[PDB]
Design a protein around this motif. Structure first.
Motif, PDB file in Angstrom:
ATOM      1  N   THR A   1     -27.752 -21.980  60.588  1.00 54.09           N
ATOM      2  CA  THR A   1     -28.200 -20.724  61.132  1.00 54.09           C
ATOM      3  C   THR A   1     -27.644 -19.787  60.019  1.00 54.09           C
TER       4      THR A   1
ATOM      5  N   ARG B   1     -33.847 -15.531  55.163  1.00 50.29           N
ATOM      6  CA  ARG B   1     -34.769 -14.525  55.628  1.00 50.29           C
ATOM      7  C   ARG B   1     -34.759 -13.173  54.940  1.00 50.29           C
TER       8      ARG B   1
ATOM      9  N   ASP C   1     -36.166 -17.221  41.377  1.00 50.43           N
ATOM     10  CA  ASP C   1     -36.111 -16.675  42.768  1.00 50.43           C
ATOM     11  C   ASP C   1     -35.181 -17.743  43.630  1.00 50.43           C
TER      12      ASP C   1
ATOM     13  N   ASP D   1     -31.541 -17.170  42.382  1.00 50.57           N
ATOM     14  CA  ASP D   1     -31.248 -15.949  43.078  1.00 50.57           C
ATOM     15  C   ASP D   1     -30.777 -16.575  44.671  1.00 50.57           C
TER      16      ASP D   1
ATOM     17  N   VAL E   1     -27.292 -18.568  44.653  1.00 50.41           N
ATOM     18  CA  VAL E   1     -26.098 -17.777  44.268  1.00 50.41           C
ATOM     19  C   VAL E   1     -25.737 -16.947  45.803  1.00 50.41           C
TER      20      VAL E   1
ATOM     21  N   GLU F   1     -24.301 -19.256  48.013  1.00 55.30           N
ATOM     22  CA  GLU F   1     -22.862 -19.303  47.469  1.00 55.30           C
ATOM     23  C   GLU F   1     -21.967 -18.322  48.110  1.00 55.30           C
ATOM     24  N   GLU F   2     -22.352 -16.992  47.871  1.00 57.00           N
ATOM     25  CA  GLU F   2     -21.636 -15.911  48.391  1.00 57.00           C
ATOM     26  C   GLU F   2     -21.562 -16.019  49.895  1.00 57.00           C
TER      27      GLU F   2
ATOM     28  N   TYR G   1     -27.976 -18.443  33.636  1.00 55.26           N
ATOM     29  CA  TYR G   1     -28.553 -17.361  34.467  1.00 55.26           C
ATOM     30  C   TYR G   1     -27.626 -17.410  35.806  1.00 55.26           C
ATOM     31  N   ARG G   2     -27.353 -18.580  36.208  1.00 58.56           N
ATOM     32  CA  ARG G   2     -26.531 -18.495  37.514  1.00 58.56           C
ATOM     33  C   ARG G   2     -24.994 -18.050  37.305  1.00 58.56           C
TER      34      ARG G   2
ATOM     35  N   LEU H   1     -25.318 -14.234  37.466  1.00 58.05           N
ATOM     36  CA  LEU H   1     -25.286 -13.665  38.949  1.00 58.05           C
ATOM     37  C   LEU H   1     -23.988 -13.838  39.668  1.00 58.05           C
ATOM     38  N   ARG H   2     -23.433 -14.962  39.538  1.00 59.02           N
ATOM     39  CA  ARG H   2     -21.977 -15.111  40.337  1.00 59.02           C
ATOM     40  C   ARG H   2     -20.936 -14.005  39.736  1.00 59.02           C
TER      41      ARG H   2
ATOM     42  N   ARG I   1     -20.152  -9.407  40.499  1.00 60.13           N
ATOM     43  CA  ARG I   1     -19.419  -8.717  41.338  1.00 60.13           C
ATOM     44  C   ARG I   1     -18.217  -8.403  40.599  1.00 60.13           C
TER      45      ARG I   1
ATOM     46  N   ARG J   1     -31.750 -10.163  35.976  1.00 55.91           N
ATOM     47  CA  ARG J   1     -33.018 -10.888  35.989  1.00 55.91           C
ATOM     48  C   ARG J   1     -34.215 -10.414  35.102  1.00 55.91           C
TER      49      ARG J   1
ATOM     50  N   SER K   1     -22.751 -17.010  66.381  1.00 56.78           N
ATOM     51  CA  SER K   1     -24.009 -18.200  66.424  1.00 56.78           C
ATOM     52  C   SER K   1     -25.044 -17.597  67.619  1.00 56.78           C
TER      53      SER K   1
ATOM     54  N   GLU L   1     -29.056 -16.545  68.073  1.00 55.58           N
ATOM     55  CA  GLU L   1     -30.063 -16.992  68.755  1.00 55.58           C
ATOM     56  C   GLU L   1     -30.626 -16.169  69.919  1.00 55.58           C
TER      57      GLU L   1
END
Ligand SMILES: CCCCCCCCCCCCCCCCCC(=O)OC[C@H](COP(=O)(O)OCCN)OC(=O)CCCCCCCCCCCCCCCCC
Ligand SMILES: CCCCCCCCCCCCCCCCCC(=O)OC[C@H](COP(=O)(O)OCCN)OC(=O)CCCCCCCCCCCCCCCCC
Ligand SMILES: CCCCCCCCCCCCCCCCCC(=O)OC[C@H](COP(=O)(O)OCCN)OC(=O)CCCCCCCCCCCCCCCCC
Ligand SMILES: CCCCCCCCCCCCCCCCCC(=O)OC[C@H](COP(=O)(O)OCCN)OC(=O)CCCCCCCCCCCCCCCCC
Ligand SMILES: CCCCCCCCCCCC(=O)OC[C@H](COP(=O)(O)OCC[N+](C)(C)C)OC(=O)CCCCCCCCCCC
Ligand SMILES: CCCCCCCCCCCC(=O)OC[C@H](COP(=O)(O)OCC[N+](C)(C)C)OC(=O)CCCCCCCCCCC
Ligand SMILES: CCCCCCCCCCCC(=O)OC[C@H](COP(=O)(O)OCC[N+](C)(C)C)OC(=O)CCCCCCCCCCC
Lengths: 95, 80, 60, 130, 118, 169, 506, 70, 108, 161, 105
Positions: free
Chosen positions: A13, A20, A45, A48, A51, A54-55, C27-28, C31-32, C35, C55, F33, F37
């Motif tokens: 989820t 999205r 992409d 991106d 990562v 990841e965050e 490149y990763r 990005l990491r 911050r 990018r 969650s 939904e």
């Protein structure tokens, strides 16, 4: 304390919501949903998104896994198996 | 205010803050001993007060070493 | 002697496929650490803008 | 060298080698039932933890903290001029030294090519200026 | 006398109060290390002098030296007292706290104007 | 939609309490969650009104999903190092069931108290029971919201559970 | 002897080089020191001479025949404990080397033995505070002897904090009494027993109740005993109780002079709660040391009923009970240390992690002990049946003598509750026996070459190699047969407890 | 730094003796020595254990170069 | 209750403190029900004792079960009525047994 | 005006709002100072000076440990409290400062009568030492024993070797 | 018998004699019970806190209020500031109201 509290439904989820917010072809994302075909991410992409995922989960993909990832379900599998809560100070636990 | 345990809000949220509370609590016992001994003109109470101060300082050191080694255990990788 | 932190040994890559993977890994890392760049350098922009700037340089 | 699952830029999961036997424990039970009958509620029971923190292979995610990094920079009497000596200390013990120079790089070698041999001589007065 | 001076040691370390100045922080560590060094020796030396006169009054100790100055019977202790004094005051050769060549100004590196004078 | 709006207020309130008193972390994941939904649910049922029965089937799907995931993990092992993923699934089922049982709908016994006379009356008029499809017919799937006070799916589960008990083949 | 020999051992340990053998031999020197201490103490202290009560050291200490018996019991149990660190418990280096890796282990024990033996003798409030610190500090240092262990250090932090709070409570109680009377000697304070606030002594008992893990302060001791190494948990869970309970008995002997029934009711409330927690607490647990922690809490509640009643029948009950419970405690932990040799080895679900400090950590690691070693399994069954109180084992007479003193004093409720508590706690005592034996027939013909014991080599294949070392086997044999066959000498042993007097006289 | 506290208390424990040296006489003097002799065992212990050194985290050891010839 | 709310505000990012505070935390209906149950117990225990010219185990059984049922119906509203009565009978029996055994000691 | 009441009022305010570990090591020093001064001016100047001599050395060692264990946790964290709830709490606390309920013992003033019999007149520390080194010499020698144990205890806990 | 209640000069303090007479009474072999030593116990406790004597002063102050007696007419004169223990208050022949020196003896 120092153990994961993750379920496969929550990780999926949270993965869908983070995916999205990108510019993907379809908003209908499930485990079988591929990154290149279904969502339409090129080389930059995809990384991106990785990562960004990841965050969200405070995990770091290894280089070998990240280069070879194809589907959304693979990410959910990785997060569930590798997630660990971050160590806290000597006072957070015992007090 | 004491019976609702107001002192539990005055103690800080670190392990060292618990150590300070213990020292303050024991120091209250010694001040009470000095006060009674002086009023009675009794040197046995002042001998007791001196013993409390030395002993209270011993456990302060013993507890500190436990907390010192506890922190070392967390910083154990020491790859340097 | 020892190398500084985050140092890589210089190697001449002779395979375009292997070169492509090394570029994507780096490149990763950019990005990491985006911050971190905002924190250390006290930038007036979000880390999201920093990642966008990264990018663009890779897209050039 | 390479971002791996147990070691990356931001954290590592360090596990030591196991000195003791790999003892196998199966069929955990209490006096009221088996482990699986209460394992749903065992998250609140510290006495029901199956993982021991003293085990060499106990998983701990430790953030990679920068060691104490000191700029022994140009504004310092010890540095004989402009030297940004970067030291990573453990208390006061030196662990790694990174001398940063070029704060007095003035392109003497580049400028000398534009000068005749006689004109380039005074440039040498100003390299080791004692 | 001993109790009052021990408070001054505390006031020095307060400058590195979770400070972001690494030279102030490095100097606070050295102040504690020097305090542990000299405090026992300086206290015990004064106690030996007080023991010889069986008094803790400073004026009585001075008047007890009419026929002899304690430099002669306790010449080793005078050196040790002065060595301890140099360490207590952070004076060279024990100026490890305010070592200019090491910690620019020590705990004073961030201090200017009135806080520096005091 | 009065009951639906009141129900979603308690879920939001428990989120505010959880952040305030630092309650169980896993509960924070459950409520977060549920709200997502619910966010998907509002989009796909606009202007149709939201009865609690449509909310009941939303929480029912979440409960059934995690039970299926828990079954696999509790048989082949959890993937995390501490082997807690399988139990985390069941812990969330309890949190979701807490809100499910607070909705103003019929319990499992009330729905069974109305279908059991129908399952038995089918078998006595016909002799043998083969499929639940003969029991779905004698169910009024138009007015079971205020005479029975149940969703469309909770009746389906009650019949399927009762059918497996009463089936002769 | 203790003090003099401790100084020599302290210096000698720091002089010679560090090796496991040298530490083990230094531990054996500690064994000789305690033996000489016992011989010297027996040579000079006799029950008949100490019946009156003899003051020592400007009346700071007061030894009588009740104090003297506990001192000898402490020395004897300390002898048995040192055999664990002075000889092989298993014979395998991966397990036994832990007991030889700390050279200050024996030094801390000798430090604590001095505190244990002097505490029942205290006759002044100033020396009461000093000694209770000496005993507590040594316990903290022993809890943290393994400083490279995360759990061992965490326990010592918990132990220090809780035990310092109790000490402050103890100090605060003595300061209040000194403020009331201006007196420090106990016998002087007894002259004003009717005028000081008696609840100032209940505060003193409350600090002592924390240090024995009584409810509601039971939580920290259950946590500490489970996290500490099994060798550490064996000592710290028993030794403080031998001295503090004896001191509590002497304090309650003075309190009963004024007969304050309100004070008797508060203590009865703590005993009642501790029986409930001690019995119901152990029902849902999977760790053996957590189970034994509740067993300790339950048996302390039984003894405190005898201490609370505080009569002629209470001296016999407490003295007999403390002796037989110490032997049962020693016997059980000796077996638990030994039977780590029968642990299976992998070659997995639940990711169970076992460390070198506590190889036996769960109750189900005792599985198939009836097959691996029938004699040891029976020895463990006899000890567990003694804790249950199955006659004619020692544990039966302990409960019988406690009930006599309790019912003689009108404690009808506590006598009924403990017997209900005994039945409830039988459920988790039986679960140990179920694990040991109940699967014998369905597992008798199985091939188990994956045990820890199988990693050991063989000498010649023509010799007979005993599977358990000589000393640890003889101790388990001796204690188990004492527990089993106490009926033979029960009459003579209880006649001896008749002579132990605490100012009875006539 | 930790060992400073036990020794600081020992030094502060001599204050009662300083102002009462005459009154206690030889009895107090012998007790004073016994107080110091028990604490001197701590001094022997700290010397022999080298507990008052600096806890470095790096150690410089000289490896020997050897050749596994054939 | 308001003392513990201060401990909440002082720290909410520490899981150790939060876990311990949740154990001692009382709901709103328990903050009202507990004083009412204890007050009804004290009133009914003394009221029955006056009726019987002394305290009896039957009087304490009645006082404890009614006081429990009154409290249970307040802070255990979301449970069946028969469940609250089952606990009240159990609670009342314990205190009746306590009185039957002579409280904590027979005394004289 | 007894200004020690105001000092303890400020100290109680800062103990309720203290957040990090440095503030706690300052609450300790902010507590010993009122104790030392009040002992100096009312009851015992000897023990006012003994407190300063011993506690300060303990305070600095305590402070140096804070440096080695400070762990970023409470600088960026948030607290809620509320100014009104703080001051109301301190007001209710200030209402009841009668630690004893013997009204006559707290209200009626007393005196002592001096006598000239003590012609050998020495300080309290000389009498304390006279008794401590003669009659309670066992207490002193046990204290020496406990100090020795701490020396061994600190080494066996902290030293890695 | 250890020493108790030692004055600041090493000898017995004000209340030692009361304590000594209690010990002698309690340890005398001529006493069947401890009843004879009950008055001696109260005397020792009165020496330290003076609680009954303070209670008597409470009654006298209260009884004087109810009869309208002036506190300043029946009490004892006092001075609160040490600097104003002047020679006029002390009653000296050449007394004065100027402050006395208390800065340095
Ligand atoms: C070594 C064992 C020596 C036993 C000595 C027991 C003892 O202390 O003496 C009996 C004691 C009364 O002694 P008392 O009368 O005061 O003095 C003169 C007596 N000769 O009475 C007592 O108070 C003793 C109280 C403690 C009794 C503990 C019983 C221990 C049972 C034997 C231990 C198990 C032996 C295991 C063998 C392992 C060694 C290989
Ligand atoms: C003012 C603050 C509240 C008062 C706390 C009192 C603490 C000391 C009292 C002694 C009990 C010591 C046990 C440990 C203390 C318990 C700490 C606590 O209060 O936590 C509450 C605990 C958690 O319960 P839970 O409802 O899950 O958490 C609340 C969720 N909001 O709920 C519990 O489990 C508490 C019950 C623990 C078991 C105690 C039982 C003792 C025996 C009682 C019955 C006696 C048996 C004899 C009866 C016959 C006589 C009538
Ligand atoms: C929950 C309620 C379930 C039943 C509660 C107890 C009922 C049993 C009972 O004994 O009722 C009696 C009770 C008062 O008890 P009692 O002390 O006997 O009255 C004075 C008589 N002279 O009378 C009652 O009011 C009940
Ligand atoms: C020569 C005078 C020296 C003191 C003058 C400065 C006055 C400040 C308060 C001094 C002590 C009063 C009581 C304070 C106890 C410690 C509590 C504390 O944390 O310090 C208060 C100080 C103010 O910080 P503030 O911004 O107001 O609060 C945090 C907001 N998030 O937060 C700080 O961390 C700053 C503290 C600086 C270091 C002070 C070290 C303590 C010194 C105490 C010596 C005097 C003893 C106390 C006497 C007064 C008793 C109330
Ligand atoms: C070492 C050098 C100082 C020194 O020797 O100083 C000590 C000597 C001798 O003085 P004294 O015998 O100690 O007594 C002091 C006697 N007055 C009071 C006369 C000084 O002072 C001088 O000759 C100067
Ligand atoms: C019983 C009679 C007592 C005598 C009383 C005096 C005691 C002094 C002890 C000194 C020992 C020492 O200097 O020690 C040296 C130590 C450590 O040196 P190390 O690493 O061991 O090397 C030396 C060992 N060698 C040579 C054997 C290899 O540090 C120092 O350099 C300390 C320098 C102190 C100088 C302070 C200046 C004071 C000026 C005074 C002006 C009035
Ligand atoms: C079964 C035994 C019950 C006895 C009957 C009784 O005690 O009867 C029930 C009592 C009535 O006592 P009452 O009405 O106060 O007194 C009666 C009138 N008098 C004052 C004239 C005498 O009340 C109760 O519920 C008390 C609960 C008792 C529980 C006992 C548990 C069993 C312990 C076993 C002891 C060896």
């Amino acid at each position: 304390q120092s153990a994961s509290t993750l379920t496969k439904e929550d990780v999926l989820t949270r993965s869908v919501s983070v995916l999205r917010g990108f510019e993907v072809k379809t908003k209908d994302i499930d485990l079988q949903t591929t990154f290149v075909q279904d969502l339409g991410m090129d080389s930059l992409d995809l990384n991106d998104a990785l990562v960004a995922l990841e965050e969200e989960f405070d995990v770091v993909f290894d280089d070998k896994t990240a280069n070879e990832i194809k589907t959304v379900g693979e990410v959910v599998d990785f997060v569930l198996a590798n997630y660990l809560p971050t160590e806290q100070s000597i006072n957070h636990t015992i007090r | 205010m004491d019976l609702i345990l107001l002192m539990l809000v005055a103690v800080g949220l670190n392990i060292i803050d618990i150590y300070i509370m213990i020292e303050i609590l024991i120091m209250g016992c010694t001040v009470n001993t000095i006060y009674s001994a002086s009023l009675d003109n009794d040197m046995i109470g002042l001998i007791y007060s001196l013993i409390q101060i030395i002993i209270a300082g011993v456990e302060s050191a013993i507890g500190l070493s436990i907390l010192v080694n506890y922190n070392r255990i967390r910083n154990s990788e020491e790859i340097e | 002697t020892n190398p500084t932190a985050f140092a890589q040994t210089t190697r001449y890559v002779k395979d375009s496929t292997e070169m492509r993977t090394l570029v994507l890994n780096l490149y990763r890392r950019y990005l990491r650490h985006s911050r971190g760049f905002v924190n250390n350098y006290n930038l007036d922009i979000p880390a999201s803008q920093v990642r966008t700037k990264i990018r663009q340089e890779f897209e050039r | 060298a390479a971002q791996t699952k147990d070691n990356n830029d931001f954290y590592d999961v360090k596990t030591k080698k196991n000195d003791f036997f790999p003892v196998q424990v199966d069929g955990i039970e209490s006096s009221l039932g088996k482990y699986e009958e209460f394992a749903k509620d065992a998250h609140e029971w510290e006495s029901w933890n199956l993982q021991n923190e003293d085990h060499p292979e106990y998983p701990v995610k430790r953030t990679k903290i920068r060691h104490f990094t000191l700029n022994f920079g140009p504004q310092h009497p010890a540095a004989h001029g402009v030297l940004r000596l970067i030291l990573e200390l453990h208390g006061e013990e030196i662990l790694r030294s990174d001398p940063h120079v070029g704060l007095l790089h003035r392109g003497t070698e580049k400028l000398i090519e534009s000068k005749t041999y006689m004109q380039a001589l005074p440039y040498f007065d100003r390299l080791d200026y004692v | 006398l001993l109790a009052s001076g021990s408070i001054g040691v505390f006031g020095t370390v307060i400058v590195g109060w979770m400070s972001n100045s690494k030279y102030t922080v490095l100097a606070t560590v050295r102040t504690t290390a020097q305090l542990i060094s000299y405090e026992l020796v300086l206290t015990t030396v004064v106690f030996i002098i007080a023991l010889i006169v069986s008094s803790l009054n400073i004026n009585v100790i001075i008047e007890s030296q009419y026929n002899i100055w304690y430099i002669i019977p306790f010449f080793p202790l005078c050196l040790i007292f002065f060595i301890s004094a140099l360490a207590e005051t952070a004076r060279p050769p024990f100026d490890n706290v305010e070592a200019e060549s090491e910690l620019v100004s020590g705990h004073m590196t961030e201090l200017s104007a009135s806080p520096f004078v005091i | 939609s009065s009951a639906y709006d009141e129900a979603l207020a308690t879920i939001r309130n428990d989120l505010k309490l959880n952040f305030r008193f630092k309650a169980d972390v896993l509960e924070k994941n459950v409520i977060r969650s549920i709200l997502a939904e619910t966010k998907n649910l509002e989009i796909d049922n606009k202007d149709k009104d939201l009865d609690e029965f449509k909310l009941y089937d939303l929480l029912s799907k979440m409960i059934k999903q995690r039970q299926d995931s828990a079954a696999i993990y509790l048989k082949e092992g959890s993937p995390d190092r501490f082997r807690q993923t399988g139990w985390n699934e069941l812990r969330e089922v309890d949190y979701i069931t807490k809100y499910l049982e607070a909705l103003p709908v019929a319990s499992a016994e009330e729905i069974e108290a109305k279908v059991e006379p129908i399952v038995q009356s089918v078998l006595e008029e016909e002799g043998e029971l083969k499929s639940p499809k003969e029991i779905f017919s004698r169910i009024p799937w138009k007015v079971v919201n205020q005479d029975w006070q149940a969703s469309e799916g909770a009746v389906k589960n009650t019949v399927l559970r009762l059918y497996n008990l009463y089936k002769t083949d | 002897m203790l003090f003099t020999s401790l100084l020599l051992i302290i210096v000698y340990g720091s002089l010679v080089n560090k090796s496991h053998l040298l530490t083990k031999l230094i531990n054996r020197l500690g064994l000789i020191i305690i033996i000489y201490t016992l011989l010297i103490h027996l040579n000079i202290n006799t029950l008949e001479n100490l019946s009156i009560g003899i003051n020592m050291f400007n009346n700071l200490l007061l030894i009588n025949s009740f104090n003297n018996t506990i001192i000898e019991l402490i020395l004897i149990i300390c002898i048995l404990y040192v055999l664990l660190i002075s000889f092989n418990i298993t014979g395998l280096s991966i397990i036994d080397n832990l007991n030889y890796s700390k050279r200050t282990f024996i030094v801390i024990v000798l430090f604590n033995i001095i505190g244990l033996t002097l505490l029942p003798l205290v006759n002044d409030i100033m020396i009461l505070f000093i000694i209770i610190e000496l005993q507590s500090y040594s316990l903290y240092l022993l809890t943290a002897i393994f400083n490279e262990s995360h759990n061992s250090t965490k326990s010592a932090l918990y132990y220090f904090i809780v035990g310092s709070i109790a000490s402050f409570i103890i100090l605060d109680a003595t300061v209040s009494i000194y403020d009331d009377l201006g007196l420090t000697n106990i016998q002087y304070i007894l002259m004003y027993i009717d005028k000081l606030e008696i609840f100032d002594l209940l505060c003193l008992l409350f600090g002592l109740f924390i240090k024995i893990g009584l409810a509601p302060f039971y939580s920290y001791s259950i946590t500490i005993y489970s996290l500490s190494p099994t060798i550490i948990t064996n000592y710290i869970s028993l030794m403080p109780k031998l001295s503090i309970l004896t001191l509590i008995y002497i304090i309650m002997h003075y309190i009963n002079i004024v007969n304050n029934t309100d004070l008797n009711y508060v203590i009865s409330f703590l005993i009642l709660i501790s029986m409930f927690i001690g019995s119901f607490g152990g029902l849902n647990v999977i760790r053996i040391k957590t189970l034994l922690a509740y067993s300790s809490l339950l048996n302390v509640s039984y003894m405190l009923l005898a201490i609370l009643s505080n009569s002629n029948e209470s001296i016999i009950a407490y003295i007999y009970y403390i002796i037989q419970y110490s032997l049962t405690h020693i016997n059980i932990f000796s077996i638990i240390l030994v039977i780590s040799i029968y642990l299976p080895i992998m070659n997995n679900m639940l990711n169970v992690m076992i460390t070198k400090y506590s190889p036996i950590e769960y109750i189900n690691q005792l599985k198939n002990l009836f097959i691996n070693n029938i004699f040891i399994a029976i020895a463990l069954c006899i000890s567990i049946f003694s804790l249950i109180g199955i006659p004619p084992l020692t544990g039966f007479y302990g409960k019988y003598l406690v009930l006599i003193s309790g019912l003689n004093n009108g404690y009808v409720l506590l006598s009924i509750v403990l017997i209900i508590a005994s039945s409830i706690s039988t459920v988790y005592y039986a679960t140990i026996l179920k694990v040991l034996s109940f699967d014998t027939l369905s597992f008798k013909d199985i091939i188990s070459n994956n045990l820890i014991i199988n990693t050991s080599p063989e000498n010649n294949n023509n010799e007979i190699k005993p599977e358990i070392s000589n000393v640890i086997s003889y101790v388990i044999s001796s204690l188990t047969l004492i527990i089993l066959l106490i009926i033979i000498q029960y009459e003579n042993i209880v006649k001896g407890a008749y002579l132990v007097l605490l100012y009875n006289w006539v | 730094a930790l060992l400073f506290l036990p020794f600081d208390l020992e030094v502060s424990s001599m204050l009662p003796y300083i102002v009462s040296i005459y009154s206690v006489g030889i009895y107090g003097l012998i007790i004073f020595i016994l107080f110091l002799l028990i604490l001197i065992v701590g001094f022997i212990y700290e010397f022999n254990t080298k507990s008052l050194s600096i806890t470095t985290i790096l150690h410089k050891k000289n490896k020997a170069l050897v050749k596994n010839l054939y | 209750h308001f003392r513990r709310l201060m401990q909440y505000k002082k720290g909410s990012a520490r899981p150790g403190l939060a876990k311990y505070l949740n154990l001692f935390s009382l709901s709103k209906s328990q903050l009202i029900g507990f004083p009412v149950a204890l007050g009804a117990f004290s009133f009914l225990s003394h009221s029955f004792a006056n009726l019987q010219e002394g305290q009896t185990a039957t009087g304490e059984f009645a006082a404890s079960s009614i006081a429990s049922l009154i409290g249970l119906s307040i802070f255990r509203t979301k449970k069946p009525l028969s469940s609250n009565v089952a606990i009240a009978v159990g609670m009342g029996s314990l205190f009746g047994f306590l009185t039957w055994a002579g409280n904590f000691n027979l005394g004289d | 005006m007894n200004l020690e009441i105001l000092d303890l009022s400020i100290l109680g305010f800062y103990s309720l709002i203290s957040s990090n570990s440095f503030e706690s090591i300052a609450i300790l020093v902010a507590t010993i100072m009122p104790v030392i001064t009040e002992l100096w001016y009312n009851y015992s100047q000897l023990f006012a000076l003994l407190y300063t001599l011993i506690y300060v050395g303990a305070v600095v060692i305590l402070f140096v440990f804070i440096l080695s264990v400070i762990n970023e946790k409470e600088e960026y964290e948030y607290e809620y409290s509320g100014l009104f709830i703080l001051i109301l709490v301190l007001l209710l606390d200030d209402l009841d400062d009668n630690e004893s309920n013997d009204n006559d013992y707290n209200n009626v003033y007393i005196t002592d009568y001096a006598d000239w019999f003590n012609n050998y007149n020495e300080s309290d520390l000389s009498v304390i030492g006279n008794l401590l080194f003669t009659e309670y010499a066992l207490l002193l020698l046990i204290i020496s024993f406990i100090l020795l144990m701490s020396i061994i205890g600190l080494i066996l806990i902290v030293k890695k070797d | 018998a250890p020493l108790q209640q030692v004055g600041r000069h090493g000898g017995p303090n004000k209340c030692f004699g009361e304590f000594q007479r209690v010990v002698e009474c309690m340890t005398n072999a001529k006493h069947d019970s401890y009843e004879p030593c009950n008055n001696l116990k109260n005397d020792y406790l009165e020496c330290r806190k003076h609680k009954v004597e303070r209670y008597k002063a409470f009654l006298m102050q209260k009884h004087a209020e109810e009869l309208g007696k002036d506190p300043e007419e029946i009490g004892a004169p006092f001075v609160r500031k040490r600097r104003f223990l002047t020679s006029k208050t002390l009653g000296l022949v050449d007394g004065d109201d100027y402050e006395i020196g208390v800065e340095k003896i």
